[PDB]
Design a protein around this ligand. Structure first.
Ligand SMILES: [Mg+2]
Lengths: 241, 662, 453
RNA sequence: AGAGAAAUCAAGGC
RNA sequence: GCCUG
């Protein structure tokens, strides 16, 4: 039933697209790359300056037209039903009274961050040293990754993980098999149904090992390069495992 | 100032960061830029000849002069053709691996460049609406104009875009047809040429370290493809040239040169300086000649040379935007009048005046050809008597001489100065300082002392939330402080203090510090503060500047399973969707603030809906660049049919769904 | 024709303002000629900056600096403290400057009264026309139009050169005076590693060093005033808004530094200037230092204070920048930390309770001073520079970094050589016009020796 | 008035 | 006289 409802909604959206945007619908598909970044807002150069005013507005947050959030709670007006508008207290209220998702979803979302936290807390630190140490910056891997996957094959790996049936066989043989297998294993529960926008980013952060210029008193492994921001500062050197 | 000059414990070089008064407001340019633009336009003509003859210099098409005309006691505004050719040949012969990498880039990477990247540029002056519009809007308008006039579909590649731009120039006339309002505008060939060659000039705002304000210039979208191609080639060649500081971070090469030493017998010297009137003393013809020499010696075909030379030639016939006009005062009143209405210090240019733009041949403008200017400066160094280590970034430069005697060092420094003049670059005599023996200097805000290169930022990190949302703002601020810490600027104490200040500002910005609506609401409902933006104590530390707030709190036990389930619930209604990565998890606190010509906002909303439907229906465009043979309609129809026909629903339900499709 | 082709018409268009074809093929034999160069002279002695001559530079900052004071009030809310101050007040004019007429005091009191009822926003009555320059642009334009005669001339702008005022030294001296309580209160970060502990200890020691100074109090006052004015910048846009500067002492007693009013501002751009009627408590009044302020005598509980009114106009960007004024603490901190971290590196043992001797070119017989005093003075000078940051300061510092590097090179007996016709002092001097802090820095530079053997 | 510095704000458009 | 900020 859910699939049928989603397909009906997609058909309604197709009607809206073909009826309201006949001119845009006839442009080249690659033209997407041009108008996916379409934006009339200028480069503000100072959103932090307007943040204070925006937060203190009567209805700063824009929320989807949901029904779980009551219109009025303990006298406070939580939402403005005409996407509807809601005040900054809504996220705080949701943190106490709100719908609860499965623990599997929570584990999947936090997989990268939880792994980073465990990696930080799963290692010991040696006696901190002090001296005239020269921190010659070098380009090293930023964060440890699931498996060694070439940057060229990263998009193919993501495609195989998410929608393997929409890619060519030659492309199917351009992605790491272990990485795709385990990423599909850990990203399966609910991250791979509709919340693809964040799931793809999490997967990329898991497999994509971006190189960065970091200070290295000694040769740095990705595990150390993750936390190199405090291992050495030209005046000290903390030795890890 | 005597306080900033220690003679014990630490050295004055360490106190250099004290001379940076960035904590105060940055200067902002006011009102008209016509005076600055006109001064920039006139400087090359004044400096072309030793005697400031402007009328005679204004008649020069290509600015080239013999060495006798080159000014040694002042700036020069021209180049020597034979010297440019010889220096380009020497540069090609010296850095052959870089030339081979450039050849590979041309033969492989260049054809695959998509013009969609042009949407990532700065503000562009649209020649259709006669207004400044963002890069995506100008690019879409230009592509539509090309499609309408050429009666063909522009290819996804950038070379196809350049070919279309060249083709539309042949037509005698062009036409463009665009709340609801229909309007058709017709341009002549000369009008389109003027729009293509016209530059848009604007004040450079919030620039520090300068007493006098200066302007920057940007080209029109018509010529942005060629400029992008040339700049990409320049970046590719520069990334493999040891003498450069733009793409390699700058600090690495300066540190490498600092680490170098000698046999404590050879005379060493360190010349650090800038170039005076760098952009007002370069001729585009010199750069195009250098590029032609590079390509010709590379064996490239004729069309490549034509493509690389077109942008420089179009820049030669530039129509700089004067702006609002010059200011005149009849006592206490003030009026703004364009050049040529009343006598002024720039009367010599009244001849080269158009409706509101001034035609200029000699000189350039800052912010348009940076990598090409760097290459022009670098080819000069490739002499037979310049055995030293030179690093140049656009304008700043540092040269390490290692000679056998002081007289040889002076001769080499003078040879460097004269060669830079030869190409058309004048090192500022006042801002150029040579220190012997070497071991002290500055370059690109990085100060080198003996064997230590300390990086000093032009501005301290903005210890304020960006303005997106609590989680994203916290992650971005922590990442910025971490980047400042690991780049050598901030140490343990400075980093921790900056984090404390940022935490205070971040808590204040989100109404979680004193008695506010958020805190009062949380207290009245017994909502225990669990996150930093909620008023809870800062869980982050100096070591844990990279861990996520939610993950760290969960590990420490500050967040329980039920709270995490309620927060990270993907069904909550308050979340939707280079060196600024954001690794914050999509929690309920990752919301968006409601931020709130009429014929363009509707188009933007329509495109937003189209891209949203594509994203939900095409679960492949978020992983790879969009690509499919055909238009949007064909691909969307195929994908929708495949999705619907692959479902497990019964035949009747499938037919019901399909029938509703328009 | 292969991949890219240029038509004949476009070729002719391109070959319009150049001497070569689309592919330049100049017919010249490539070689590098020899040009008669010049001699590279040596900077035997460091230069001396130009000390301007003119009227002493007044205090042109937004709020008061070292002279700022506060009134102690019983613990309570800002409304309670404002009501307590207003109820017991005998404000009377003492020195009325034509720039800030004394009548404008009526605006301040009417605001305080309005703040004692719980409504900071107040409506204009009579005195806001001159207090905030309402409809002043039209008046100036009409006056200029009615007095128009002559011929248009290229507008000439001149910056009135001024000399070093004698109050910069006094401000520097009074800014580093010790206080009773700590004025820097920042929530500490969590500690999970020895590195975190060391960083927190260093930050705590720095705050202890610079926390109990007058400069810290002035920084807190500036931060509070800027934050409260910037926050209430679009509250009403048509009525006078009250933004009192009130702090809480550890005992809980309120401290009233002053009062900032916002006029009926009509702000469109981010660089526009909104009017203000800053009213602040002084400690000592000098006519030559505050020629535009108007000083009144305010009596509270028998005690007497001076209240200075100024008619200012400040931009949104400047208010936002001064809201985050705490960043001024970052620059000195590093210099302190490095010194500490310099002592730990030479013996592989950290020591937070270390303040070695820093030698300096001091006017008196003193050879130098201690790390704590030097850091306090650095914080004071950096705060003054930040307050007085304008294009003159930017250019002066940018062009004085070169001379600082040259001085450091001379200190190590490194010969500094210069090109032909080079005058870095010429670049530095053009930035010395009015800025009193720039003049103070130039005097300090001139004080130090210019010859090193 | 005032802010400010090489030209603007001290409200603009229709 | 109407309206944005
Ligand atoms: Mg330099």
């Amino acid at each position: 039933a859910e699939s049928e409802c989603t397909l009906r909604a997609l058909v309604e959206e197709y009607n809206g697209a073909c009826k309201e945007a006949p001119k845009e619908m006839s442009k080249q598909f690659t033209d997407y790359n041009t108008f996916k970044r379409y934006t009339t807002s200028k480069k503000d150069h100072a959103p932090q300056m307007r943040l204070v005013y925006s937060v203190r507005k009567p209805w700063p947050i824009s929320m989807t037209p949901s029904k779980e959030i009551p219109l009025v709670f303990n006298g406070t007006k939580l939402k403005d039903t005409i996407r509807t508008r809601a005040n900054i207290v809504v996220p705080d209220y949701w943190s106490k009274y709100g719908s609860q998702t499965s623990l599997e979803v929570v584990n999947a979302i936090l997989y990268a961050e939880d792994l980073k936290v465990q990696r930080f807390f799963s290692t010991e630190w040696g006696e901190i040293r002090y001296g005239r140490m020269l921190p010659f910056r070098k380009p090293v891997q930023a964060c440890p990754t699931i498996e060694e996957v070439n940057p060229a094959s990263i998009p193919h790996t993501l495609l195989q993980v998410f929608c393997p049936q929409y890619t060519t066989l030659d492309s199917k043989r351009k992605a790491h098999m272990g990485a795709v297998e385990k990423l599909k294993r850990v990203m399966e529960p609910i991250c791979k149904v509709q919340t693809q926008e964040s799931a793809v980013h999490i997967a990329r952060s898991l497999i994509d090992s971006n190189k960065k210029w970091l200070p290295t008193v000694v040769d740095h492994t990705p595990r150390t390069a993750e936390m190199a921001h405090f291992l050495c500062s030209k005046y000290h050197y903390v030795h890890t495992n | 100032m005597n306080l900033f000059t220690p003679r014990s414990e630490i050295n004055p070089t360490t106190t250099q960061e004290l001379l940076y008064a960035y904590t105060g407001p940055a200067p902002v340019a006011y009102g008209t830029r016509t005076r600055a633009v006109l001064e920039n336009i006139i400087r090359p003509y004044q400096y072309f000849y030793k005697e400031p003859n402007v009328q005679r210099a204004l008649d020069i098409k290509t600015g080239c002069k013999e060495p006798e005309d080159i000014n040694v006691e002042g700036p020069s505004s021209g180049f020597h053709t034979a010297s440019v050719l010889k220096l380009a040949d020497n540069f090609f012969r010296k850095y052959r691996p870089a030339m081979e990498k450039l050849k590979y880039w041309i033969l492989v990477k260049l054809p695959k460049l998509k013009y969609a990247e042009l949407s990532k540029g700065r503000q562009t002056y649209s020649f259709i609406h006669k207004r400044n519009l963002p890069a995506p809007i100008a690019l879409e308008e230009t592509v539509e104009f090309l499609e309408q006039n050429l009666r063909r579909k522009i290819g996804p590649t950038l070379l196809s875009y350049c070919q279309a731009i060249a083709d539309v120039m042949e037509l005698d006339e062009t036409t463009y047809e665009g709340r609801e309002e229909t309007y058709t505008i017709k341009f002549s060939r000369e009008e389109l040429w003027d729009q293509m060659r016209t530059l848009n000039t604007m004040w450079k705002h919030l620039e520090r370290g300068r007493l006098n304000r200066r302007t920057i210039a940007t080209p029109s979208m018509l010529i942005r493809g060629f400029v992008k191609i040339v700049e990409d080639a320049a970046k590719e060649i520069l990334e493999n040239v040891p003498t450069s500081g733009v793409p390699v971070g700058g600090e690495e090469k300066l540190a490498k040169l600092a680490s170098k030493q000698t046999f404590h017998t050879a005379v060493t010297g360190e010349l650090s300086g800038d170039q005076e009137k760098f952009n007002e003393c370069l001729d585009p013809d010199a750069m195009r000649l250098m590029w032609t020499v590079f390509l010709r010696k590379l064996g490239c075909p004729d069309w490549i040379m034509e493509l690389f030379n077109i942008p420089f030639m179009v820049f030669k016939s530039k129509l700089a935007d004067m702006g609002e006009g010059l200011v005149y005062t009849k006592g206490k009143l003030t009026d703004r009048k364009p050049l040529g209405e009343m006598p002024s210090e720039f009367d010599d240019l009244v001849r080269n005046v158009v409706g509101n733009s001034i035609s200029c041949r000699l000189g350039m403008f800052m912010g348009m050809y940076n990598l090409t200017s760097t290459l022009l400066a670098l080819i000069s160094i490739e002499r037979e008597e310049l055995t030293g280590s030179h690093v140049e970034s656009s304008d700043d430069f540092i040269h390490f001489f290692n000679c056998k005697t002081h007289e040889e060092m002076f001769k080499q420094a003078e040879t460097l100065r004269l060669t830079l003049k030869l190409v058309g670059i004048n090192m500022s005599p006042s801002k150029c300082i040579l220190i012997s023996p070497a071991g002290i200097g500055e370059f690109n805000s990085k100060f080198h002392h003996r064997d230590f290169v300390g990086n000093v930022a032009t501005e301290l990190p903005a210890l304020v939330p960006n303005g997106t949302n609590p989680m994203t703002d916290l992650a971005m601020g922590l990442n910025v402080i971490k980047h400042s810490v690991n780049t050598g600027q901030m140490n343990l104490c400075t980093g921790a203090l900056a984090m404390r200040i940022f935490n205070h500002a971040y808590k204040y910005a989100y109404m979680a510090l004193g008695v506010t609506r958020r805190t009062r609401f949380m207290e009245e409902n017994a909502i225990t503060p669990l996150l930093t933006n909620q008023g809870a104590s800062p869980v982050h530390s100096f070591s844990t500047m990279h861990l996520d707030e939610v993950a760290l709190r969960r590990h420490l036990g500050l967040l329980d399973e039920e709270t995490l389930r309620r927060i990270l619930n993907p069904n909550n209604p308050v979340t939707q969707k280079q060196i600024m990565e954001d690794y914050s998890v999509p929690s309920c606190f990752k919301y968006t603030l409601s931020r709130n010509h009429k014929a363009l906002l509707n188009k933007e909303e329509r495109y937003q809906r189209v891209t949203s439907i594509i994203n939900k229906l095409f679960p492949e465009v978020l992983i790879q660049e969009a690509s499919a043979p055909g238009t949007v309609r064909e691909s969307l129809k195929r994908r929708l049919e495949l999705v619907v026909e692959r479902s497990d629903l019964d035949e009747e339900r499938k037919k019901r769904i399909l029938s509703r499709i328009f | 024709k292969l991949q890219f082709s240029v038509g004949t018409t476009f070729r002719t268009l391109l070959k319009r303002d150049t001497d070569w074809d689309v592919i330049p093929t100049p017919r010249v034999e490539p070689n590098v000629p020899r040009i008669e160069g010049r001699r590279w002279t040596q900077m035997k002695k460091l230069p001396l900056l130009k000390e301007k001559e003119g009227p002493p530079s007044p205090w042109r900052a937004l709020l008061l600096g070292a002279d700022s004071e506060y009134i102690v009030c019983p613990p309570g809310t800002d409304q309670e403290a404002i009501s307590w101050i207003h109820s017991q007040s005998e404000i009377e004019c003492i020195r009325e400057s034509k720039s800030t007429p004394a009548s404008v005091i009526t605006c301040l009191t009417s605001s305080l009264q309005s703040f004692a009822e719980g409504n900071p926003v107040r409506s204009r009555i009579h005195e806001d026309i001159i207090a905030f320059g309402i409809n002043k642009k039209q008046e100036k334009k009409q006056s200029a139009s009615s007095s128009a005669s002559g011929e248009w001339k290229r507008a000439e702008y001149q910056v009135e050169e001024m000399s070093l005022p004698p109050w910069v030294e006094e401000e520097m001296v009074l800014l580093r005076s010790d206080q009773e309580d700590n004025w820097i209160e920042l929530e500490k970060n969590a500690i999970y590693t020895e590195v975190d502990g060391v960083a927190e200890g260093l930050v705590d020691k720095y705050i202890e060093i610079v926390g109990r100074t007058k400069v810290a109090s002035v920084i807190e006052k500036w931060q509070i005033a800027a934050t409260r004015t910037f926050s209430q910048l679009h509250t009403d846009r048509s009525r006078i808004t009250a933004c009192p500067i009130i702090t809480r002492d550890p005992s809980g007693n309120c401290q009233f530094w002053g009062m900032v009013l916002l006029g009926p501002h009509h702000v469109k751009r981010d660089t526009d200037n909104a009017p203000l009627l800053i009213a602040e408590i002084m400690g000592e009044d000098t006519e030559e230092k505050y020629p535009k302020h108007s000083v009144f005598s305010l009596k509270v509980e028998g005690k007497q204070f001076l209240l200075s009114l100024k008619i200012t106009s400040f931009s949104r960007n400047k208010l936002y920048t001064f809201s985050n004024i705490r960043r001024v603490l970052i620059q000195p901190a590093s210099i302190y930390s490095q010194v500490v971290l310099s002592r730990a590196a030479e013996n592989n043992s950290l020591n937070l309770e270390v303040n070695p001797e820093i030698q300096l070119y001091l006017e008196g017989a003193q050879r130098g001073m201690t790390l704590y005093q030097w850091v306090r003075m650095i914080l004071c000078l950096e705060f003054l520079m930040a307050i007085y940051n304008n294009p003159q300061m930017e250019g002066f510092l940018a062009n004085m970094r070169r001379l600082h590097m040259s001085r450091h090179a001379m200190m190590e007996r490194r010969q500094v050589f210069l090109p032909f016709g080079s005058r870095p002092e010429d670049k530095v001097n053009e930035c010395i016009i009015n800025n009193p802090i720039v003049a103070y820095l130039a005097k300090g530079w001139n004080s130090m020796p210019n010859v090193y053997y």
